[PDB]
């Protein structure tokens, strides 16, 4: 009986749920050629978090723990803690710690550390390759490449803050990251577990609607496109509201609040993704003050007004 | 049009509104001796954002713009844009661009840049000294100290991502940052404008309640304590709900959902800060699952149950 709704927020007011950066635009494209199975930004419309999804956007692609130096290298193994520094439990029924990256690529950021006895601190450039054999966050271990072979201490609180992505400029431009390729969360010690399911439009003539950002690039010629299935604020809002789904499909209209004019309509599926009636790869051009409005639950046969 | 409320979120599920990091604890202490006037994390209970507050946790202490430098210099001046890359208008009735840092200190992070013709990218260590004469975000310009004297291009999209704070280890430990000292947003040039007001308890025996985090340290012996008056999620929630204030004070109770018991009560003032009945500098020790819950609107001279 509690009524469903989505937040009154513009696209630019919202945040990507797969990296800590604002949304920029709405994009639609076919996706039959590849598997769409992101693990961050996954939530049902009645507020059940899925995959590796957690609530605050600043924890997305962050890691915390302590580090051990790999002798003869500038590499360090982080022994992960949970996002609140609690001991990490690998038997929890999740694919990896909440907020773990859900794509294969090279994420550059900064490893910072505090020494607890005296409050001394340090920071160094660091990169995590999430396709590495040594990317094993589900087992509590992640390897970082850094610019030091000596400065970090053992058993001291250490954090990785993500900044952006890189690419090898001597190879084909934009060939990485690969945002729809999941990592092996156990570094191939075993298969991935407890995943949010892959998504695909099932209705004739429909495509996914993607909430898109441009990740910062730190070196090379990376593919900076990053698409999420739900804005982080929608995850946060559905978790709070926990309104029951009266059918499997919520009908949303995208509206200009100055005029009341509806720009387009789309389907928000109960399991947490959006489709539109469109064929082709296109950016939507929108009014900056436009926002989504929930109008009606609809049945499995409802045909959207075509766009594009 | 529901009654006024606060979100059902634990302390650790929420985010500092003054730096993009999680909350860690609740802290109370006297503040009669200094000025408490932060500009981020400022919002009335009915959803009016104040100061430099905006909605995105990830934009707090971020800057966007393009950069120039004097030939041979490691210091780059950024000509600021708005957070969505729009032109920045210095005649807007705000203290500085939304999300500008609201304390004097040295914030270290990374300046990233993309060259639009070919998608080439670059990233460099960067520090902004918010006490500098060259820190003039209200005028549209700030300077970054970087580790390059040649590797940024003019007129290209450039972003500063914050990571943590630093201190000069050759001087008294923890002497900076100074979290309650506001920068001069227009440089040495003129006084600050359009500030969210200073806050103080007015009821006898009351103190402010602070939502506290520890900022990452990147070098030296910084003071990493960071207190905000409202979690970022409460700013987001009040903006979204916009419930009118029925008196000047909302009584909240902190509830342990493990037991049903109320641990303490506090006053949420309609202008956006919290007070408790206590004398002393003390950390609150809480159940991890504890959360705040609205109980009722109260008159101006309600007396809280004492704590501590």
């Amino acid at each position, epitope marked *: 009986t509690k009524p469903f709704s989505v937040p009154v927020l513009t696209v630019e007011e919202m945040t990507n749920s797969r990296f800590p950066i604002p949304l*920029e*635009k*709405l994009f*639609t494209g076919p996706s039959s050629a590849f598997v769409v199975q992101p693990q961050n930004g996954r939530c049902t419309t009645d507020g059940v978090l899925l995959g590796t999804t957690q609530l605050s956007p600043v924890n997305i692609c962050t890691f915390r723990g302590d580090v051990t130096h790999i002798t003869g290298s500038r590499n360090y193994t982080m022994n992960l803690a949970s996002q609140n520094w609690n001991d990490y439990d690998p038997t929890e029924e999740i694919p990896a710690p909440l907020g773990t990256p859900d794509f294969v690529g090279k994420i550059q950021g900064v490893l910072t550390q505090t020494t607890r006895t005296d409050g001394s601190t340090r920071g160094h450039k660091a990169t995590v390759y999430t396709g590495s054999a040594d990317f094993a966050p589900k087992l509590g271990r992640v390897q970082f490449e850094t610019d030091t072979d000596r400065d970090f201490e053992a058993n001291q609180n250490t954090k990785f803050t993500p900044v952006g992505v890189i690419q090898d400029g001597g190879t084909t431009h934009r060939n990485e990251p690969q945002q729809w390729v999941l990592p092996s969360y156990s570094g191939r010690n075993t298969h991935n577990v407890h995943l949010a399911p892959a998504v695909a439009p099932t209705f004739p003539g429909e495509q996914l609607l993607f909430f898109r950002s*441009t990740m910062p690039g730190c070196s090379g010629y990376p593919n900076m496109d990053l698409d999420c299935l739900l804005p982080q604020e929608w995850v946060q809002y559905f978790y709070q509201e926990a309104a029951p789904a009266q059918s499997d499909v919520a009908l949303l209209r995208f509206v200009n609040p100055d005029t009341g004019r509806v*720009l*387009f309509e789309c389907k928000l599926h109960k399991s947490g993704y959006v489709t539109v009636a*469109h064929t*082709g*790869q*296109h*950016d*939507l*051009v*929108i*009014p*900056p003050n436009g926002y989504f409005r929930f109008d009606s639950w609809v049945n499995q046969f409802y045909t959207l007004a075509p*766009m*594009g | 049009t529901k009654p006024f409320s606060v979100p059902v979120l634990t302390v650790e599920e929420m985010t500092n509104s003054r730096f993009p990091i999680p909350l860690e604890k609740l802290f109370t202490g006297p503040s009669s001796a200094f000025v408490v006037q932060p500009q981020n994390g400022r919002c009335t209970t009915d959803g009016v954002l104040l100061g430099t507050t905006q909605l995105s946790p990830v934009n707090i202490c971020t800057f*966007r*713009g*393009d950069v120039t430098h004097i030939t041979g210099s490691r210091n780059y001046t950024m*000509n600021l*844009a708005s957070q969505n*890359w*729009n*032109d920045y208008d210095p005649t807007e009735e705000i203290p500085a661009p939304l999300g500008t840092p609201d304390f004097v200190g040295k914030i270290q992070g990374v300046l990233t840049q993309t060259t*639009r*013709t070919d998608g080439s990218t670059r990233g460099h260590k960067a520090t902004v000294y918010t006490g500098s004469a060259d820190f003039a975000p209200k005028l549209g310009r700030v300077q970054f100290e970087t580790d390059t004297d040649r590797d940024f291009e*003019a*007129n*290209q*999209n*450039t972003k500063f991502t914050p990571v943590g704070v630093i201190q000069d280890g050759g001087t008294t430990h923890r002497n900076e940052p100074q979290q309650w000292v506001l920068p001069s947003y227009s440089g040495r040039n003129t006084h600050n404008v359009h500030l969210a007001p200073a806050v103080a308890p007015t009821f006898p025996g009351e103190q402010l309640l602070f939502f506290r985090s520890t900022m990452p340290g990147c070098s030296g012996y910084p003071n990493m304590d960071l207190d905000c008056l409202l979690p970022q999620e409460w700013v987001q929630y009040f903006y979204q709900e916009a419930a009118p204030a029925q008196s000047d004070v909302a009584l909240l109770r902190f509830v342990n959902p493990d037991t049903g018991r109320v641990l303490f009560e506090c006053k949420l003032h309609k202008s956006g800060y919290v007070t408790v009945a206590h004398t002393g500098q003390h950390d609150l020790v809480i159940p991890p699952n504890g959360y705040f819950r609205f109980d009722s609107w109260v008159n101006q001279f309600y007396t809280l149950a004492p704590m501590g």
Partner: nanobody, 125 residues
Framework: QVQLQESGGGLVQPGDSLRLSCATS????????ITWFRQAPGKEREGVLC????????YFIDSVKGRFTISRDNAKNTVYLQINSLKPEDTANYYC??????????????????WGQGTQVTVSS
């Protein structure tokens, strides 16, 4: 996959007129803000004038307002820049740039995610 492509430049005669076109593909729904920039020798790309999705026009350089006209042809997904009475000061590489919004005419290059490769205008000696 958005694409912008400018055409219409060349070595042109003072006092003649010309028409640049900015052809776009890859957008749906609203009509995008489009702005013409130019880069004169030794300078950065500078914003000249802009047309919103509602065809509201903003000039960023006051000296061009007598002679430069921007317009939109929705049916051919093109925006034009017509220049009357060409003058040597008009000489530059001309770029069009687009935003995925119907409103917001901004003067700075960083406000635009999408760009063409440019067309050169040289008012000949």
């Amino acid at each position: 996959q958005v694409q912008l492509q400018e055409s219409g430049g060349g070595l042109v005669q003072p006092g003649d007129s010309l028409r640049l076109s900015c052809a776009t593909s890859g957008f749906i729904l609203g009509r995008p803000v489009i702005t013409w920039f130019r880069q004169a020798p030794g300078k950065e790309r500078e914003g000249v004038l802009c047309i919103s999705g509602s065809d509201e026009i903003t000039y960023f350089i006051d000296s061009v307002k007598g002679r430069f006209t921007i317009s939109r042809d929705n049916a051919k997904n093109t925006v034009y820049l017509q220049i009357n009475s060409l003058k040597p000061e008009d000489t530059a590489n001309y770029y069009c740039a687009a935003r995925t919004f119907t409103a917001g005419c901004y003067s700075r290059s960083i406000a635009y995610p999408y760009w063409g490769q440019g067309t050169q205008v040289t008012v000949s000696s």
